[PDB]
Amino acid sequence: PQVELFVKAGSDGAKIGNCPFSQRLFMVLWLKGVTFNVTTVDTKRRTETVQKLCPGGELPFLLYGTEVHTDTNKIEEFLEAVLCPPRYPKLAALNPESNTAGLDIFAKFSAYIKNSNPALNDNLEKGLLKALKVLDNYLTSPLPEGVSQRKFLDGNELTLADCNLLPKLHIVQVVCKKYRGFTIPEAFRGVHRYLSNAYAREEFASTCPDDEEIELAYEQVAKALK
Ligand SMILES: N[C@@H](CCC(=O)N[C@@H](CS)C(=O)NCC(=O)O)C(=O)O
């Protein structure tokens, strides 16, 4: 049954664009091992065919046979349910906490990077560091369930939880380094090992837009502190 994912185009109207939701779904589809195709969409200059399959302009979106699916959460739920054992592996996490750990980081990053006043930067940076620390503690602490030194959020295999979080953390890293010279403290070993382990996996590394695309995507979002 034909699978086609539709994602946002980057700076040249063609490359895969910066977008954590698209990357999340790309990762899920790759980890499932299903045959699928991808199509990029220049939100301004969309094609006639795309203007019809998805009139509301939602992105990403997924075609399953001739059926269009929208909303990243709903698409992911659908894929986990229909691409299932024995043909395709179950990707859901075992430990519920894995599905929330570190997701507050992205919001904290956003607030931090859009602010330009140095008086407020002190507080936003500390809140970002605190959220990184909370994730670091999750990664270094043993998990309740699972047959810490594990590679990923929930054990040693990538799960749906990593597909959501990794694309966001990657953006946090790339954007923070470029626009603020900020790096995730080396003191946070759980976070750095997670990112190193994730980078070593094609499913994550290969689905990241290039750094230039990510930076350019933030050009009118990210501010230098005055
Ligand atoms: N509600 C959608 C949100 C998707 C979304 O945020 N898409 C982004 C990036 S792919 C977007 O449309 N960005 C447009 C822009 O800011 O220019 C979902 O969660 O699936």
Short mmCIF file of C-alpha atoms and ligand atoms in Angstrom, two decimals:
data_model
loop_
_atom_site.label_atom_id
_atom_site.label_comp_id
_atom_site.label_asym_id
_atom_site.label_seq_id
_atom_site.Cartn_x
_atom_site.Cartn_y
_atom_site.Cartn_z
CA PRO A 1 0.00 0.00 0.00
CA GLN A 2 1.73 3.14 -1.25
CA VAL A 3 3.12 5.53 1.38
CA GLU A 4 3.98 9.14 0.55
CA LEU A 5 5.10 11.79 3.05
CA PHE A 6 4.78 15.52 2.19
CA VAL A 7 7.20 17.89 3.93
CA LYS A 8 8.28 21.52 3.94
CA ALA A 9 10.89 22.63 1.38
CA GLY A 10 13.96 24.53 2.56
CA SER A 11 15.60 27.69 1.25
CA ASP A 12 15.79 26.78 -2.44
CA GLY A 13 12.22 25.54 -2.72
CA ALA A 14 13.57 22.03 -3.17
CA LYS A 15 15.66 20.62 -0.36
CA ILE A 16 14.02 19.21 2.69
CA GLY A 17 13.32 22.14 4.97
CA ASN A 18 13.82 22.77 8.63
CA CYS A 19 10.84 21.23 10.45
CA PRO A 20 10.94 18.90 13.48
CA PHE A 21 7.52 17.41 12.67
CA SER A 22 8.61 16.26 9.20
CA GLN A 23 11.82 14.85 10.55
CA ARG A 24 9.91 13.01 13.28
CA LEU A 25 7.73 11.24 10.68
CA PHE A 26 10.66 10.53 8.41
CA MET A 27 12.35 8.79 11.33
CA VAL A 28 9.25 6.73 12.21
CA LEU A 29 8.84 5.58 8.57
CA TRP A 30 12.55 4.65 8.27
CA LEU A 31 12.54 2.74 11.62
CA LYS A 32 9.41 0.81 10.49
CA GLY A 33 11.26 -0.31 7.36
CA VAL A 34 8.24 0.34 5.14
CA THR A 35 8.71 1.33 1.48
CA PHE A 36 7.79 5.06 1.16
CA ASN A 37 8.51 8.22 -0.82
CA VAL A 38 8.96 11.82 0.20
CA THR A 39 7.82 15.01 -1.59
CA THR A 40 8.87 18.57 -0.66
CA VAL A 41 6.55 21.57 -0.74
CA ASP A 42 7.42 25.22 -1.26
CA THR A 43 4.60 26.64 0.91
CA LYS A 44 4.34 29.64 -1.37
CA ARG A 45 4.71 28.03 -4.79
CA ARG A 46 2.82 24.79 -4.19
CA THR A 47 1.96 22.53 -7.11
CA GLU A 48 -1.50 22.11 -8.59
CA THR A 49 -1.70 18.52 -7.37
CA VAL A 50 -0.71 19.40 -3.79
CA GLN A 51 -3.16 22.31 -3.77
CA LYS A 52 -5.83 19.64 -4.26
CA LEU A 53 -4.77 16.79 -1.96
CA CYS A 54 -4.45 19.22 0.90
CA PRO A 55 -6.43 22.46 0.37
CA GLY A 56 -5.92 23.64 3.97
CA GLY A 57 -2.17 23.79 3.43
CA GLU A 58 -1.33 21.62 6.43
CA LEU A 59 2.25 20.24 6.46
CA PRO A 60 3.52 17.69 6.94
CA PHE A 61 0.86 15.41 5.52
CA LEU A 62 0.75 11.75 4.51
CA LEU A 63 -0.84 9.89 1.67
CA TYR A 64 -1.66 6.25 2.42
CA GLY A 65 -2.97 4.76 -0.82
CA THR A 66 -5.37 7.54 -1.82
CA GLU A 67 -6.16 8.62 1.78
CA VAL A 68 -4.69 11.88 3.13
CA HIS A 69 -3.67 12.09 6.80
CA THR A 70 -2.97 15.32 8.67
CA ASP A 71 -1.59 16.35 12.07
CA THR A 72 1.77 14.85 12.96
CA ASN A 73 0.51 13.22 16.19
CA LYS A 74 -2.36 11.53 14.38
CA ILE A 75 -0.14 10.41 11.52
CA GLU A 76 2.33 8.87 13.95
CA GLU A 77 -0.41 7.06 15.84
CA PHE A 78 -1.77 5.70 12.57
CA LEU A 79 1.63 4.49 11.37
CA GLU A 80 2.37 2.72 14.67
CA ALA A 81 -1.02 1.02 14.53
CA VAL A 82 -0.98 -0.10 10.90
CA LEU A 83 2.70 -0.73 10.28
CA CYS A 84 2.85 -3.48 12.93
CA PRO A 85 4.41 -6.84 13.75
CA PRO A 86 5.26 -9.21 12.37
CA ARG A 87 6.09 -7.33 9.12
CA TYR A 88 7.12 -4.08 10.90
CA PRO A 89 8.52 -3.48 14.40
CA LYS A 90 6.54 -1.87 17.23
CA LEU A 91 8.18 1.51 17.96
CA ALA A 92 6.33 2.70 21.07
CA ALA A 93 8.27 3.26 24.26
CA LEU A 94 7.78 0.94 27.22
CA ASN A 95 8.29 3.56 29.94
CA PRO A 96 5.65 6.27 29.87
CA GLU A 97 8.16 8.87 31.17
CA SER A 98 10.14 8.39 27.97
CA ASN A 99 7.33 10.03 26.06
CA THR A 100 7.65 13.32 27.97
CA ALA A 101 11.27 13.61 29.08
CA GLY A 102 12.98 16.64 27.57
CA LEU A 103 10.05 17.86 25.47
CA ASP A 104 9.89 21.10 27.50
CA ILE A 105 13.36 21.95 26.21
CA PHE A 106 12.17 23.06 22.78
CA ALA A 107 9.74 25.63 24.21
CA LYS A 108 12.42 26.96 26.54
CA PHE A 109 14.83 27.21 23.61
CA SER A 110 12.30 29.11 21.53
CA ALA A 111 11.69 31.72 24.21
CA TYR A 112 15.45 31.97 24.79
CA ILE A 113 16.36 32.50 21.15
CA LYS A 114 13.63 35.02 20.34
CA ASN A 115 14.51 37.27 23.27
CA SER A 116 17.04 40.05 22.58
CA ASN A 117 17.23 41.77 25.93
CA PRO A 118 20.30 40.76 27.95
CA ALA A 119 18.52 41.38 31.25
CA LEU A 120 16.07 38.63 30.45
CA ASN A 121 18.60 36.37 28.75
CA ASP A 122 20.13 35.52 32.13
CA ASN A 123 16.88 33.98 33.31
CA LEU A 124 15.90 32.27 30.03
CA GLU A 125 19.33 30.68 29.64
CA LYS A 126 19.16 29.29 33.17
CA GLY A 127 15.71 27.84 32.50
CA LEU A 128 17.03 26.20 29.36
CA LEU A 129 19.95 24.77 31.29
CA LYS A 130 17.59 23.47 33.98
CA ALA A 131 15.46 21.69 31.40
CA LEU A 132 18.59 20.18 29.85
CA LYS A 133 19.64 18.98 33.30
CA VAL A 134 16.26 17.34 33.91
CA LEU A 135 16.66 15.39 30.66
CA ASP A 136 20.25 14.53 31.61
CA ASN A 137 19.00 13.04 34.89
CA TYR A 138 16.40 11.01 33.01
CA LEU A 139 19.15 9.62 30.74
CA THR A 140 21.60 8.72 33.48
CA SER A 141 19.04 7.16 35.80
CA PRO A 142 18.00 3.51 35.32
CA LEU A 143 14.61 3.00 33.74
CA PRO A 144 11.86 1.13 35.64
CA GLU A 145 11.05 -1.21 32.70
CA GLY A 146 13.37 -2.91 30.22
CA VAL A 147 15.30 -6.17 30.06
CA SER A 148 22.09 3.94 33.36
CA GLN A 149 24.27 3.34 30.30
CA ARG A 150 21.51 2.76 27.71
CA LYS A 151 21.79 4.47 24.33
CA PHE A 152 18.43 6.17 23.93
CA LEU A 153 15.44 7.52 25.86
CA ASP A 154 13.78 4.18 26.53
CA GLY A 155 16.52 1.55 26.26
CA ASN A 156 18.91 0.61 23.48
CA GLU A 157 16.61 0.86 20.46
CA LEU A 158 15.16 4.04 18.97
CA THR A 159 11.50 4.49 19.79
CA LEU A 160 8.74 6.97 18.85
CA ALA A 161 9.85 9.05 21.78
CA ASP A 162 13.30 9.62 20.23
CA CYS A 163 11.72 10.48 16.90
CA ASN A 164 9.97 13.43 18.52
CA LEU A 165 12.82 14.66 20.74
CA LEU A 166 15.94 14.17 18.60
CA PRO A 167 14.96 16.50 15.75
CA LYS A 168 14.15 19.22 18.33
CA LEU A 169 17.36 18.86 20.32
CA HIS A 170 19.29 18.94 17.08
CA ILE A 171 17.69 22.28 16.20
CA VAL A 172 18.41 23.61 19.72
CA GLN A 173 22.08 22.70 19.28
CA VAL A 174 22.53 24.09 15.78
CA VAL A 175 20.62 27.31 16.45
CA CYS A 176 22.06 28.02 19.90
CA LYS A 177 25.65 27.51 18.75
CA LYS A 178 25.30 29.76 15.70
CA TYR A 179 23.28 32.62 17.13
CA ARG A 180 24.51 32.66 20.73
CA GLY A 181 27.72 30.63 20.84
CA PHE A 182 25.89 28.49 23.38
CA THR A 183 26.63 24.80 23.73
CA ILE A 184 25.07 22.12 25.82
CA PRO A 185 27.40 21.90 28.79
CA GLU A 186 29.89 19.06 28.58
CA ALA A 187 28.96 18.42 32.23
CA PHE A 188 25.73 16.88 30.93
CA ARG A 189 27.04 13.41 29.96
CA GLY A 190 23.68 11.77 29.60
CA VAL A 191 22.62 14.36 27.03
CA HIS A 192 25.93 14.31 25.13
CA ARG A 193 26.07 10.49 24.95
CA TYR A 194 22.46 10.41 23.75
CA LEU A 195 23.24 12.92 21.01
CA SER A 196 26.46 11.03 20.09
CA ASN A 197 24.60 7.70 19.96
CA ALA A 198 21.83 9.30 17.88
CA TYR A 199 24.31 10.92 15.45
CA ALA A 200 25.83 7.49 14.83
CA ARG A 201 22.45 6.26 13.58
CA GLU A 202 21.62 6.92 9.94
CA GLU A 203 17.91 7.25 10.73
CA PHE A 204 18.65 10.43 12.67
CA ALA A 205 21.79 11.78 10.98
CA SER A 206 20.49 11.36 7.48
CA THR A 207 17.13 12.97 8.18
CA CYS A 208 18.60 16.22 9.58
CA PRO A 209 18.37 19.18 7.19
CA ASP A 210 21.88 20.57 6.70
CA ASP A 211 23.04 23.10 9.31
CA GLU A 212 22.76 25.97 6.83
CA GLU A 213 19.11 25.26 6.20
CA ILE A 214 18.45 25.12 9.96
CA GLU A 215 20.24 28.41 10.65
CA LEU A 216 18.53 30.15 7.74
CA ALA A 217 15.19 28.86 8.96
CA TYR A 218 15.85 30.81 12.18
CA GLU A 219 17.17 34.00 10.60
CA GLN A 220 13.96 35.91 11.31
CA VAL A 221 13.28 34.21 14.64
CA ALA A 222 16.61 34.17 16.43
CA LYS A 223 17.93 37.46 17.85
CA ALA A 224 21.39 38.49 18.95
CA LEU A 225 21.41 39.90 22.48
CA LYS A 226 21.84 43.62 22.14
N1 LIG B 1 -0.30 21.17 13.66
C1 LIG B 1 0.79 20.67 12.83
C2 LIG B 1 1.91 21.69 12.92
C3 LIG B 1 2.89 21.50 11.77
C4 LIG B 1 3.87 22.65 11.69
O1 LIG B 1 4.09 23.35 12.66
N2 LIG B 1 4.47 22.85 10.53
C5 LIG B 1 5.48 23.89 10.44
C6 LIG B 1 6.83 23.34 9.98
S1 LIG B 1 6.79 21.86 8.94
C7 LIG B 1 5.03 25.02 9.55
O2 LIG B 1 3.98 24.93 8.94
N3 LIG B 1 5.81 26.09 9.48
C8 LIG B 1 5.43 27.22 8.66
C9 LIG B 1 6.18 28.50 8.96
O3 LIG B 1 6.38 28.87 10.11
O4 LIG B 1 6.60 29.19 8.04
C10 LIG B 1 1.26 19.36 13.38
O5 LIG B 1 1.55 19.28 14.57
O6 LIG B 1 1.33 18.40 12.63
#
